[model samples]
Target: MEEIEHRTVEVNGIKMHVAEKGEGPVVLFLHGFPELWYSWRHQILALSSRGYRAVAPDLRGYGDTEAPVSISSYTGFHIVGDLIALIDLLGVDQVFLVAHDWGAIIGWYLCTFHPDRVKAYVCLSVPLLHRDPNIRTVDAMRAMYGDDYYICRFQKPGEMEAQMAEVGTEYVLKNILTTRKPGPPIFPKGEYGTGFNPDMPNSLPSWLTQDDLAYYVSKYEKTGFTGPLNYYRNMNLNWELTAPWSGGKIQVPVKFITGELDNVYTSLNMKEYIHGGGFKQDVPNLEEVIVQKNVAHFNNQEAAEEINNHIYDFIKKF
Candidate 1:
């Protein structure tokens, strides 16, 4: 196996940390919120072995990357700007791209707005949440769920940070890294993972080994989740800023690998809103929608080997 090397390069004025493992067609990896460039460790090895340049970089504010104080600074347009700067710096006109979580959402924006820049896209989890222009306003989700729910309650500024500070990031680590029992996650009785799947009655699935999770923990300890949580906090702002983002379906070779147990899919068909609510057009180029069974939100880490195998095959078929 080829060894992966790390380097720091400046993009958009901030010095970003990037990991690369091979020399071939480039796959510029943009990591999701609460994740560093290392999130794609398994895919790096898999793609590198197959002769693809697998490059994963820390998104602004995750790992070694710099952070901006304001929530508005992390908007979708700014994210697209960061990548534009990155591609220019690498001197590459276009490349294949893969991303999970928040990263996948960014890819969706990039593909939809700038299809000319991407060869293909592999979206892992967090599939496109098409906007409904008719939605007079993006409502408060927590209000619907009630006070017992944390994510809803988490919307309150400083409250979440205070609780997380008390718990020491353990809540996030345990929830994402492993499965919960028939109960809620260690935090809200794991209600976050609830309704994701009706058939499965076990805890959320465990994905990463101890060492790998420790690595994520240590990195978070250094930088904290403010920037990542900022990504979540700006939901309504994102809705406001990207009027162009509203209602237009993405047209590109696309793949959605959703965890069978992941809340994004299992919880509900909340996405039925895309077409029925408004936007009457179908995504003519949508290639695949894969729902993996028994997997949790962190499908990439929980099932890295299997996920990579599928990616290799998907890119071939794509």
Candidate 2:
């Protein structure tokens, strides 16, 4: 891990904190909500040793990257803009993209908006969310899951932040990172943020150590949750901004992997979407989908070795 190098680069009107290693074909790794480039620590080391330049960044509004205060700034265009500019700075025409969670969402946009800049993509957790031109994203989610649904609860600014403050950052981080709950996770009124409940285990999961938890806690302690929450706040705006490409498909080749027990996969009829051919129709070049048994949402971190192999095996084919 010490071999990994960290630096800041100016991109898309913000300074992005990037961690990179090795010097072969660039494998850009993007992280999910409540996570930083550190989420890719295992993959970074493993892939770099296997002869690929592994790059992970704390995307805008997370970690060391500059956070724009306005909710509108977290739109897909702005985030993808940051990525395209970062790609140009890398002096590479295209890169192998490996992303999970929220990063996977951004990866879909990056591929759709600028397919030429991606050689292939290894998407985890989230899939290409096919846009419904008639209904906005948040409203649809609210209609399906109700206001207490985690995403809907997150819609209000300061509300979730206040909840986070109540339980404290460590409690919040540990609960979220260690949760193994199934789909449509909710936070009932008066309940703490996300999956916080009395049933949350007191111990950290085996994959996450005390140091790992502490690292995340320290960063969130400094940065707060506003910037990350801003991503959710922009769902309506992103829907409006991306209207031009509502029915567009992702042109880049893709390999998707998700844990069988992942809340996203188990909920939302994702099984039908992924297995019923909806995923392929939207991503015409989709190549593979692997569901790792017993693995949950944070599969990349929880099952690093397997995910590393999955990534290497697929991307090497290109």
Candidate 3:
């Protein structure tokens, strides 16, 4: 872990904190919400040791990176633009992309807008979300899961942030990071912060160590959830801004892996979408899909060894 080097790069008008190690074909890892570049710590080490340069950035609005205050600044274009600039600065024409959660969403955008920039994508957790020309993304989600759905709850800017504050940052992070629940996660209106059982176990999961949790807690405590939450806040704007590419296909080779118990995989008939041809229809070059048994949302962290092999095995072919 100590061998990994950290640096700040000026990209897309923001200073992004990037952690990298090794030397070979570049593998850029993008982390999800409530996470930082540290989320890819295990993979960074594992992949780096195996002849690939692993780079994980604490993207625009997260730890040590510049967080643009405007919700408008967090749109897909802005995030993907930062990545493009980062790629250019790295002197690489393309990178092996690895991402999860919100990072996976941004990965899809990167693949859509700049497919040539990614040689292949190893996506975890989230899938390719097809754009709906008729309704805004958030509104469509609201219609299906109602206002209490986690994403819907995030729509109202300060509401969720305030709730997270009241419950304490560690508690909130623990609640989210340790969640084992199934899809369509709901945070019942007005009960988001206090609703979760405060008496939840203090012991860390096998995948998470006291040191790991502390690293996350320290970053979130310093930055707060606002920057991370802003990503969710931009769902509608991202949808509106991406209209030009509504039906665009991701031409990059893709290998998708999700936990069997992942809320996203189980919720909203996503299983059907992934297995039922809709996903492949959109991402035409999607090469493989693997559902890890008994894993959850943070599969990369929860099942790091397997994810590393999944990434190396697929990207090696390209």
Candidate 4:
């Protein structure tokens, strides 16, 4: 196994732990929902060996990253600011940005609002559904399902953050490495998450193996999760800054990959949005949207080799 190196740095007055290794075109990996740098454990070594420098940090409110108190501190605009500063911190003009879930959402915001800083982007699971803050569609997912959906539950004040704190370390590891269970399944917050059905799982995924999941939990036990969860609380601010460009386009090249079985997508035909919809018609370089069968939201952990090869070919184009 290749050794991983980690360091703590202060960004925006909050200290964040970033894990770095390898060297090449800088690829910044951002993790989502209660996960941290360790979430990219699979890609760090692989990308590094492929002549790419990979940087994974516990985004603002996950793992060892600092969790600022207010919701405004963790919104998309601020988090993107952190990433831009990070890019500037490393003195790079642009990078290959990769993110999963909310990390992907944040990456989308960056590419949309600050396209110059990103060379290309890889978004997994949730695509960037721009803010029509006028319509809190995601939150409605919560009111109907409660916190079972996790993300929406997070928007309501500080309730969801406390739930993650209650779960302690395992908050870092989900079914992504275990069974295909997309959840707020086990937690009380789950009742609201499972569309009001308490026994059902909140998310639709079955990935990570038990041993791999243990590693995620152990890492979070040592690093806490306030930073990761903070992303949800910032919805309004993220909406405010980004809503104006709600219909704006991403001119840069983008490759979207999502699991076929991933039910998270409310609609399957939504690929039109990426291709030539009025929503994001501005993307002049949308090369591919690979949807696979027999997979779930955590396709990165479940079908990584397929993902790696897809990335391998995509990066070759540019």
lDDT of each: 0.69, 0.90, 0.89, 0.67
* Deviating ranges (above 4 Å) for candidate 3: 194-200
Residues 1-318, model 3: lDDT tens digits: 889999999998899999999999999999998899999998999999999999999988899999988877888889999999999988999999999999999999999888988999999999998787998888888899887888888878798888888878888888888877776887766956533333356687899998999999999999988888899898888888888898888899999999998888988779888999999999889899999999988999999999999998898897
Q: Residue 254 of candidate 4: its Cα lDDT?
A: 83
Off by over 4 Å in 4: 137-149, 161-207, 222-226, 266-282
> Which 10 residues in a row give candidate 1 its minimum summed lDDT?
189-198
lDDT of 2 at 97: 99
Worst 10 residues of 4 by lDDT: 191-200
Better of 1 and 2 by lDDT: 2
State the TM-score for model 1.
0.85
Best by lDDT: 2
lDDT of 2: 0.90
For residues 1-318, write the lDDT of model 2, one tens digit per residue.
Answer: 889999999998899999999999999999998899999999999999999999999999999999998888888889999999999999999899999988998998899888998999999999988788889988888888888888888889898899989989999898888878777887868768456343577677799999999999999999999989988888888888888898888889999999987888987678999999999999999999999999989999999999999999999998
Clashing pairs in 3: none
Q: Write the per-residue lDDT of candidate 1 for residues 79-122, one digit (tens) a residue.
A: 77888888877778777888888898788778877887787787
User: How does each model score on TM-score?
Assistant: 0.85, 0.98, 0.97, 0.82
* Separate clash counts for every candidate: 13, 0, 0, 23
* Greater-lDDT candidate between 1 and 4: 1
Residues 1-318, model 4: lDDT tens digits: 357778888776678788888888888998876455776877887887788888998787676667677656877877887787777777788898888888888888888778888888887877667555455655555555565455665556656545555544453245223334333333343332322133334543345555666767876676554555566666655666665786676877888888765545434234455445533455556666777787766677778778777766777567
Q: Candidate 4 versus the native: TM-score?
A: 0.82
Best candidate, TM-score: 2
- Kindly indicate the candidate among 2 and 4 with the higher TM-score: 2
